[PDB]
Amino acid sequence: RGSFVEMVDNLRGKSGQGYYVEMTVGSPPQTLNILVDTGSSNFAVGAAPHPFLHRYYQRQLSSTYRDLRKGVYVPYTQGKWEGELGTDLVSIPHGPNVTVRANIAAITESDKFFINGSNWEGILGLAYAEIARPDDSLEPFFDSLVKQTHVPNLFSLQLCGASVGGSMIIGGIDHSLYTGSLWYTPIRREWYYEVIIVRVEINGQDLKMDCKEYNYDKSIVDSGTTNLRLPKKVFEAAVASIKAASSTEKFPDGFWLGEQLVCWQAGTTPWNIFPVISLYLMGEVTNQSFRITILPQQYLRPVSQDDCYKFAISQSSTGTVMGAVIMEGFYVVFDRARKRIGFAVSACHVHDEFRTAAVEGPFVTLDMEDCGYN
Ligand SMILES: NC1=N[C@](c2ccc(OC(F)F)cc2)([C@@H]2C[C@H]2C(=O)c2cncc(Cl)c2)CO1
Ligand code: NA
Ligand code: NA
């Protein structure tokens, strides 16, 4: 409890391409880099020589592979992966010193899934069985890990933005990774890591929307999404307020829609024209909330001889997505045992001399249960 030095710095990443952890599959162990994804629930790995892949799972080389004689087809947008299900022995070299027999989807065909030039070859879906493919009887990796070992039923993530890195602490918390106190919001339902946002402020100014809008049709914490994604109506209200706060300088209308970048010469980014963004989350106690605050350092993503940034807040039709834009400000504790998610100021988040990311409570917020969409 509290200190896991061997897992510190076990994540690496390229900006906008997610964070991955080294894993091994099969016997003898085959090493793969695997995207850490709290927004899905399948352990799926490249298993054929796709040109983009540095490497892939060669089941024929594993004496411990067991075929489940079942295929899985997984469309989404944009894209798809298809694979064959089995089990095999899985370890995390810079994780707990255990080995688990986990479900693995061997990806044999995909479209717009693997990224050309990325250093990961599969994804580790850390969410719950209710969104596993093909169905909730395919036990997710972390469920198997907890069933078969004594690893406590929780993990935590410190994503450090900018080559990026960070830490996945499996089975506990490392208090070096955060400053101040952890604040917890309930996991509303175990499918995604679903939470309830109860108030949104831009530079301290309330958007004053019916809070059910903030969670239309859900709000999730998702390490496998780059952006803060906001439901359309909330996004419209949000940019408008951000546009207004930031009007000392003017930017193309397309910038706010992510359709073009904006640049400034090096050292010349005007952070302070941009507002902070505060999400109040449902607390642990009736009528009690807390708030997490992020900087433009978080929602202006670095991507000419200038520092060009992408606006990393974007509209959504799947509800709010707290992606790397949120998570890079905080140490985030996925406290599965207590069905709650803790947030604390991250010891590694990017800021400036004037503003820091923040986690503050308690606040008095009534009718928070009304904020959840049904
Ligand atoms: N959270 C989420 N993960 C995704 C995903 C795609 C299929 C699934 O199938 C699953 F059921 F196996 C699951 C998740 C993508 C893997 C992520 C991805 O491609 C990505 C690209 N750039 C940056 C990041 Cl941070 C991630 C879609 O959104
Ligand atoms: Na256990
Ligand atoms: Na600390």
PDB file of all heavy atoms in Angstrom, residues 17 72 74 80 101 107 118 129 143 156 158-159 193 202 226 252 258 262 275 281 285 294 299 308 324 327 349 372:
ATOM      1  N   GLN A  17      -1.515   9.716 -29.346  1.00  0.00           N
ATOM      2  CA  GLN A  17      -1.623   8.298 -29.691  1.00  0.00           C
ATOM      3  C   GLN A  17      -1.771   7.407 -28.461  1.00  0.00           C
ATOM      4  O   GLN A  17      -1.536   6.203 -28.556  1.00  0.00           O
ATOM      5  CB  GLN A  17      -0.420   7.841 -30.506  1.00  0.00           C
ATOM      6  CG  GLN A  17      -0.388   8.387 -31.912  1.00  0.00           C
ATOM      7  CD  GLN A  17       0.842   7.926 -32.695  1.00  0.00           C
ATOM      8  OE1 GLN A  17       1.612   7.097 -32.241  1.00  0.00           O
ATOM      9  NE2 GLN A  17       1.021   8.481 -33.871  1.00  0.00           N
ATOM     10  N   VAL A  72     -14.693 -13.103 -32.980  1.00  0.00           N
ATOM     11  CA  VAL A  72     -15.292 -11.875 -32.473  1.00  0.00           C
ATOM     12  C   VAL A  72     -15.101 -10.791 -33.522  1.00  0.00           C
ATOM     13  O   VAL A  72     -14.006 -10.628 -34.070  1.00  0.00           O
ATOM     14  CB  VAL A  72     -14.704 -11.464 -31.099  1.00  0.00           C
ATOM     15  CG1 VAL A  72     -13.148 -11.312 -31.142  1.00  0.00           C
ATOM     16  CG2 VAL A  72     -15.382 -10.194 -30.588  1.00  0.00           C
ATOM     17  N   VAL A  74     -15.773  -6.713 -34.306  1.00  0.00           N
ATOM     18  CA  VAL A  74     -15.958  -5.539 -33.453  1.00  0.00           C
ATOM     19  C   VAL A  74     -15.932  -4.277 -34.300  1.00  0.00           C
ATOM     20  O   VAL A  74     -14.879  -3.635 -34.449  1.00  0.00           O
ATOM     21  CB  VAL A  74     -14.907  -5.485 -32.331  1.00  0.00           C
ATOM     22  CG1 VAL A  74     -15.148  -4.286 -31.449  1.00  0.00           C
ATOM     23  CG2 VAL A  74     -14.938  -6.785 -31.492  1.00  0.00           C
ATOM     24  N   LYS A  80     -12.829  -0.926 -37.368  1.00  0.00           N
ATOM     25  CA  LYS A  80     -13.242  -2.273 -37.010  1.00  0.00           C
ATOM     26  C   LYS A  80     -12.007  -3.117 -36.699  1.00  0.00           C
ATOM     27  O   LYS A  80     -10.926  -2.887 -37.259  1.00  0.00           O
ATOM     28  CB  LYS A  80     -14.067  -2.886 -38.153  1.00  0.00           C
ATOM     29  CG  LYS A  80     -14.196  -4.396 -38.141  1.00  0.00           C
ATOM     30  CD  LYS A  80     -13.988  -4.952 -39.548  1.00  0.00           C
ATOM     31  CE  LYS A  80     -12.562  -5.436 -39.749  1.00  0.00           C
ATOM     32  NZ  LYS A  80     -12.234  -5.559 -41.204  1.00  0.00           N
ATOM     33  N   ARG A 101      -4.004 -16.303 -16.397  1.00  0.00           N
ATOM     34  CA  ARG A 101      -4.553 -16.836 -17.640  1.00  0.00           C
ATOM     35  C   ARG A 101      -5.707 -15.921 -18.035  1.00  0.00           C
ATOM     36  O   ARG A 101      -6.744 -15.915 -17.372  1.00  0.00           O
ATOM     37  CB  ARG A 101      -5.035 -18.284 -17.499  1.00  0.00           C
ATOM     38  CG  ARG A 101      -5.678 -18.832 -18.813  1.00  0.00           C
ATOM     39  CD  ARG A 101      -5.771 -20.388 -18.908  1.00  0.00           C
ATOM     40  NE  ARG A 101      -4.454 -21.020 -19.032  1.00  0.00           N
ATOM     41  CZ  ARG A 101      -3.803 -21.172 -20.178  1.00  0.00           C
ATOM     42  NH1 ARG A 101      -4.348 -20.730 -21.316  1.00  0.00           N
ATOM     43  NH2 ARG A 101      -2.600 -21.744 -20.187  1.00  0.00           N
ATOM     44  N   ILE A 107      -6.167 -10.453 -33.037  1.00  0.00           N
ATOM     45  CA  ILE A 107      -6.699  -9.675 -34.149  1.00  0.00           C
ATOM     46  C   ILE A 107      -6.081 -10.173 -35.449  1.00  0.00           C
ATOM     47  O   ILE A 107      -4.865 -10.098 -35.645  1.00  0.00           O
ATOM     48  CB  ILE A 107      -6.429  -8.178 -33.970  1.00  0.00           C
ATOM     49  CG1 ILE A 107      -7.085  -7.668 -32.668  1.00  0.00           C
ATOM     50  CG2 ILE A 107      -6.916  -7.405 -35.197  1.00  0.00           C
ATOM     51  CD1 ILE A 107      -6.644  -6.200 -32.379  1.00  0.00           C
ATOM     52  N   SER A 118       2.880   4.223 -34.804  1.00  0.00           N
ATOM     53  CA  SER A 118       2.753   4.110 -33.354  1.00  0.00           C
ATOM     54  C   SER A 118       3.547   2.911 -32.846  1.00  0.00           C
ATOM     55  O   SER A 118       3.900   2.006 -33.597  1.00  0.00           O
ATOM     56  CB  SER A 118       1.286   3.993 -32.947  1.00  0.00           C
ATOM     57  OG  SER A 118       0.868   2.662 -33.040  1.00  0.00           O
ATOM     58  N   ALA A 129     -17.107  -5.919 -17.727  1.00  0.00           N
ATOM     59  CA  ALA A 129     -17.581  -6.973 -18.621  1.00  0.00           C
ATOM     60  C   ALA A 129     -18.831  -6.583 -19.395  1.00  0.00           C
ATOM     61  O   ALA A 129     -19.066  -7.130 -20.474  1.00  0.00           O
ATOM     62  CB  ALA A 129     -17.844  -8.247 -17.831  1.00  0.00           C
ATOM     63  N   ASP A 143     -10.525  -8.242 -14.258  1.00  0.00           N
ATOM     64  CA  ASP A 143     -11.326  -9.239 -13.550  1.00  0.00           C
ATOM     65  C   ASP A 143     -10.565 -10.553 -13.345  1.00  0.00           C
ATOM     66  O   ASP A 143     -10.485 -11.061 -12.218  1.00  0.00           O
ATOM     67  CB  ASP A 143     -12.625  -9.459 -14.310  1.00  0.00           C
ATOM     68  CG  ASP A 143     -13.554  -8.255 -14.217  1.00  0.00           C
ATOM     69  OD1 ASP A 143     -13.413  -7.307 -15.013  1.00  0.00           O
ATOM     70  OD2 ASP A 143     -14.391  -8.229 -13.304  1.00  0.00           O
ATOM     71  N   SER A 156      -4.441   2.617 -10.596  1.00  0.00           N
ATOM     72  CA  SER A 156      -4.458   4.066 -10.730  1.00  0.00           C
ATOM     73  C   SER A 156      -3.538   4.485 -11.857  1.00  0.00           C
ATOM     74  O   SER A 156      -2.597   3.765 -12.215  1.00  0.00           O
ATOM     75  CB  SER A 156      -4.043   4.756  -9.418  1.00  0.00           C
ATOM     76  OG  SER A 156      -2.918   4.127  -8.863  1.00  0.00           O
ATOM     77  N   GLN A 158      -1.392   7.784 -13.726  1.00  0.00           N
ATOM     78  CA  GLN A 158      -0.790   9.109 -13.789  1.00  0.00           C
ATOM     79  C   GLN A 158      -0.313   9.257 -15.232  1.00  0.00           C
ATOM     80  O   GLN A 158       0.669   8.637 -15.618  1.00  0.00           O
ATOM     81  CB  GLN A 158       0.347   9.250 -12.781  1.00  0.00           C
ATOM     82  CG  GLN A 158       0.896  10.709 -12.694  1.00  0.00           C
ATOM     83  CD  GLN A 158       2.345  10.782 -12.260  1.00  0.00           C
ATOM     84  OE1 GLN A 158       3.200  10.089 -12.801  1.00  0.00           O
ATOM     85  NE2 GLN A 158       2.637  11.661 -11.287  1.00  0.00           N
ATOM     86  N   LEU A 159      -1.053  10.001 -16.040  1.00  0.00           N
ATOM     87  CA  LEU A 159      -0.667  10.267 -17.410  1.00  0.00           C
ATOM     88  C   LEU A 159       0.051  11.618 -17.457  1.00  0.00           C
ATOM     89  O   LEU A 159      -0.531  12.640 -17.090  1.00  0.00           O
ATOM     90  CB  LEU A 159      -1.905  10.250 -18.293  1.00  0.00           C
ATOM     91  CG  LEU A 159      -2.780   8.991 -18.130  1.00  0.00           C
ATOM     92  CD1 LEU A 159      -3.894   9.056 -19.137  1.00  0.00           C
ATOM     93  CD2 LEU A 159      -1.981   7.658 -18.266  1.00  0.00           C
ATOM     94  N   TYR A 193     -16.364   3.403 -17.083  1.00  0.00           N
ATOM     95  CA  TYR A 193     -16.159   4.073 -15.797  1.00  0.00           C
ATOM     96  C   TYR A 193     -17.013   5.329 -15.816  1.00  0.00           C
ATOM     97  O   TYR A 193     -16.560   6.432 -16.106  1.00  0.00           O
ATOM     98  CB  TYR A 193     -14.692   4.384 -15.536  1.00  0.00           C
ATOM     99  CG  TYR A 193     -13.939   3.130 -15.239  1.00  0.00           C
ATOM    100  CD1 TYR A 193     -13.104   2.539 -16.210  1.00  0.00           C
ATOM    101  CD2 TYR A 193     -14.090   2.503 -14.025  1.00  0.00           C
ATOM    102  CE1 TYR A 193     -12.438   1.364 -15.949  1.00  0.00           C
ATOM    103  CE2 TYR A 193     -13.445   1.329 -13.744  1.00  0.00           C
ATOM    104  CZ  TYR A 193     -12.611   0.761 -14.705  1.00  0.00           C
ATOM    105  OH  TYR A 193     -11.966  -0.396 -14.403  1.00  0.00           O
ATOM    106  N   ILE A 202     -16.496  27.813 -16.579  1.00  0.00           N
ATOM    107  CA  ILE A 202     -15.402  28.319 -17.411  1.00  0.00           C
ATOM    108  C   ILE A 202     -14.878  29.574 -16.729  1.00  0.00           C
ATOM    109  O   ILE A 202     -15.601  30.576 -16.617  1.00  0.00           O
ATOM    110  CB  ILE A 202     -15.845  28.635 -18.850  1.00  0.00           C
ATOM    111  CG1 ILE A 202     -16.577  27.464 -19.521  1.00  0.00           C
ATOM    112  CG2 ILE A 202     -14.664  29.096 -19.686  1.00  0.00           C
ATOM    113  CD1 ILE A 202     -15.736  26.224 -19.731  1.00  0.00           C
ATOM    114  N   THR A 226      -8.136  10.948 -26.566  1.00  0.00           N
ATOM    115  CA  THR A 226      -7.210  12.059 -26.367  1.00  0.00           C
ATOM    116  C   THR A 226      -7.921  13.277 -25.769  1.00  0.00           C
ATOM    117  O   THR A 226      -7.400  13.914 -24.843  1.00  0.00           O
ATOM    118  CB  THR A 226      -6.562  12.458 -27.701  1.00  0.00           C
ATOM    119  OG1 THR A 226      -5.715  11.403 -28.153  1.00  0.00           O
ATOM    120  CG2 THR A 226      -5.726  13.719 -27.526  1.00  0.00           C
ATOM    121  N   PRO A 252      -9.375  31.484 -36.076  1.00  0.00           N
ATOM    122  CA  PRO A 252     -10.360  31.065 -37.081  1.00  0.00           C
ATOM    123  C   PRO A 252     -11.479  30.260 -36.439  1.00  0.00           C
ATOM    124  O   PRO A 252     -11.255  29.499 -35.496  1.00  0.00           O
ATOM    125  CB  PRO A 252      -9.539  30.211 -38.054  1.00  0.00           C
ATOM    126  CG  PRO A 252      -8.112  30.623 -37.829  1.00  0.00           C
ATOM    127  CD  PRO A 252      -8.007  31.034 -36.394  1.00  0.00           C
ATOM    128  N   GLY A 258     -11.749  22.109 -34.183  1.00  0.00           N
ATOM    129  CA  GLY A 258     -10.689  21.157 -34.427  1.00  0.00           C
ATOM    130  C   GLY A 258     -10.297  20.995 -35.880  1.00  0.00           C
ATOM    131  O   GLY A 258      -9.474  20.124 -36.188  1.00  0.00           O
ATOM    132  N   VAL A 262      -3.832  26.364 -34.613  1.00  0.00           N
ATOM    133  CA  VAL A 262      -3.397  27.725 -34.356  1.00  0.00           C
ATOM    134  C   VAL A 262      -1.967  27.643 -33.847  1.00  0.00           C
ATOM    135  O   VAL A 262      -1.579  26.670 -33.193  1.00  0.00           O
ATOM    136  CB  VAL A 262      -4.321  28.450 -33.347  1.00  0.00           C
ATOM    137  CG1 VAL A 262      -4.275  27.766 -31.994  1.00  0.00           C
ATOM    138  CG2 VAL A 262      -3.934  29.908 -33.211  1.00  0.00           C
ATOM    139  N   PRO A 275      -9.215  30.543 -20.523  1.00  0.00           N
ATOM    140  CA  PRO A 275      -9.829  30.277 -19.221  1.00  0.00           C
ATOM    141  C   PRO A 275      -9.498  28.881 -18.710  1.00  0.00           C
ATOM    142  O   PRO A 275      -9.202  27.966 -19.483  1.00  0.00           O
ATOM    143  CB  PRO A 275     -11.322  30.387 -19.527  1.00  0.00           C
ATOM    144  CG  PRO A 275     -11.423  29.821 -20.929  1.00  0.00           C
ATOM    145  CD  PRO A 275     -10.147  30.275 -21.637  1.00  0.00           C
ATOM    146  N   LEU A 281     -17.799  17.262  -9.766  1.00  0.00           N
ATOM    147  CA  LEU A 281     -18.248  15.885  -9.818  1.00  0.00           C
ATOM    148  C   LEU A 281     -19.071  15.579  -8.585  1.00  0.00           C
ATOM    149  O   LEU A 281     -18.813  16.132  -7.505  1.00  0.00           O
ATOM    150  CB  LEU A 281     -17.049  14.932  -9.891  1.00  0.00           C
ATOM    151  CG  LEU A 281     -16.103  15.273 -11.075  1.00  0.00           C
ATOM    152  CD1 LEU A 281     -14.878  14.339 -11.066  1.00  0.00           C
ATOM    153  CD2 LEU A 281     -16.877  15.104 -12.360  1.00  0.00           C
ATOM    154  N   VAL A 285     -20.834  11.954  -0.509  1.00  0.00           N
ATOM    155  CA  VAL A 285     -21.831  12.228   0.515  1.00  0.00           C
ATOM    156  C   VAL A 285     -23.010  12.936  -0.137  1.00  0.00           C
ATOM    157  O   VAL A 285     -22.859  13.727  -1.079  1.00  0.00           O
ATOM    158  CB  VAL A 285     -21.206  13.084   1.653  1.00  0.00           C
ATOM    159  CG1 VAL A 285     -22.255  13.494   2.692  1.00  0.00           C
ATOM    160  CG2 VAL A 285     -20.051  12.308   2.352  1.00  0.00           C
ATOM    161  N   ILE A 294      -8.816  22.235 -14.910  1.00  0.00           N
ATOM    162  CA  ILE A 294      -7.732  22.048 -15.870  1.00  0.00           C
ATOM    163  C   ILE A 294      -7.478  23.359 -16.593  1.00  0.00           C
ATOM    164  O   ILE A 294      -8.354  24.229 -16.701  1.00  0.00           O
ATOM    165  CB  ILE A 294      -8.000  20.947 -16.903  1.00  0.00           C
ATOM    166  CG1 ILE A 294      -9.160  21.340 -17.802  1.00  0.00           C
ATOM    167  CG2 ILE A 294      -8.251  19.589 -16.204  1.00  0.00           C
ATOM    168  CD1 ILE A 294      -9.334  20.437 -19.014  1.00  0.00           C
ATOM    169  N   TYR A 299      -5.950  21.521 -22.465  1.00  0.00           N
ATOM    170  CA  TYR A 299      -6.885  21.368 -23.583  1.00  0.00           C
ATOM    171  C   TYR A 299      -6.405  22.002 -24.887  1.00  0.00           C
ATOM    172  O   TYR A 299      -7.123  21.928 -25.895  1.00  0.00           O
ATOM    173  CB  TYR A 299      -8.281  21.898 -23.214  1.00  0.00           C
ATOM    174  CG  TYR A 299      -8.421  23.379 -22.919  1.00  0.00           C
ATOM    175  CD1 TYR A 299      -8.537  24.304 -23.953  1.00  0.00           C
ATOM    176  CD2 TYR A 299      -8.503  23.849 -21.599  1.00  0.00           C
ATOM    177  CE1 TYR A 299      -8.698  25.673 -23.673  1.00  0.00           C
ATOM    178  CE2 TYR A 299      -8.660  25.197 -21.317  1.00  0.00           C
ATOM    179  CZ  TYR A 299      -8.756  26.105 -22.353  1.00  0.00           C
ATOM    180  OH  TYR A 299      -8.912  27.445 -22.063  1.00  0.00           O
ATOM    181  N   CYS A 308       2.435  24.974 -32.700  1.00  0.00           N
ATOM    182  CA  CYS A 308       1.050  24.865 -33.154  1.00  0.00           C
ATOM    183  C   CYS A 308       0.271  23.905 -32.256  1.00  0.00           C
ATOM    184  O   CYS A 308       0.719  22.784 -31.985  1.00  0.00           O
ATOM    185  CB  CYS A 308       0.975  24.412 -34.617  1.00  0.00           C
ATOM    186  SG  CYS A 308       1.845  25.524 -35.782  1.00  0.00           S
ATOM    187  N   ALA A 324      -7.446  12.122 -22.178  1.00  0.00           N
ATOM    188  CA  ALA A 324      -6.138  12.547 -21.681  1.00  0.00           C
ATOM    189  C   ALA A 324      -6.099  14.021 -21.315  1.00  0.00           C
ATOM    190  O   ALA A 324      -5.319  14.393 -20.437  1.00  0.00           O
ATOM    191  CB  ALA A 324      -5.037  12.252 -22.710  1.00  0.00           C
ATOM    192  N   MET A 327      -7.261  13.703 -17.827  1.00  0.00           N
ATOM    193  CA  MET A 327      -6.460  12.827 -16.972  1.00  0.00           C
ATOM    194  C   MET A 327      -5.031  13.311 -16.793  1.00  0.00           C
ATOM    195  O   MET A 327      -4.409  13.026 -15.757  1.00  0.00           O
ATOM    196  CB  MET A 327      -6.469  11.396 -17.535  1.00  0.00           C
ATOM    197  CG  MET A 327      -7.887  10.821 -17.528  1.00  0.00           C
ATOM    198  SD  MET A 327      -7.918   9.081 -17.985  1.00  0.00           S
ATOM    199  CE  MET A 327      -6.937   8.365 -16.605  1.00  0.00           C
ATOM    200  N   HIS A 349       1.742  17.162 -13.796  1.00  0.00           N
ATOM    201  CA  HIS A 349       0.962  17.844 -14.822  1.00  0.00           C
ATOM    202  C   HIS A 349       1.632  19.144 -15.271  1.00  0.00           C
ATOM    203  O   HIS A 349       2.360  19.784 -14.516  1.00  0.00           O
ATOM    204  CB  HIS A 349      -0.457  18.124 -14.325  1.00  0.00           C
ATOM    205  CG  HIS A 349      -0.561  19.320 -13.437  1.00  0.00           C
ATOM    206  ND1 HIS A 349      -0.279  19.273 -12.089  1.00  0.00           N
ATOM    207  CD2 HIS A 349      -0.944  20.593 -13.701  1.00  0.00           C
ATOM    208  CE1 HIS A 349      -0.460  20.474 -11.562  1.00  0.00           C
ATOM    209  NE2 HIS A 349      -0.862  21.292 -12.520  1.00  0.00           N
ATOM    210  N   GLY A 372     -28.040  12.651 -13.559  1.00  0.00           N
ATOM    211  CA  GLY A 372     -27.794  11.420 -14.293  1.00  0.00           C
ATOM    212  C   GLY A 372     -28.865  11.154 -15.338  1.00  0.00           C
ATOM    213  O   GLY A 372     -30.061  11.148 -15.035  1.00  0.00           O
TER     214      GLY A 372
END
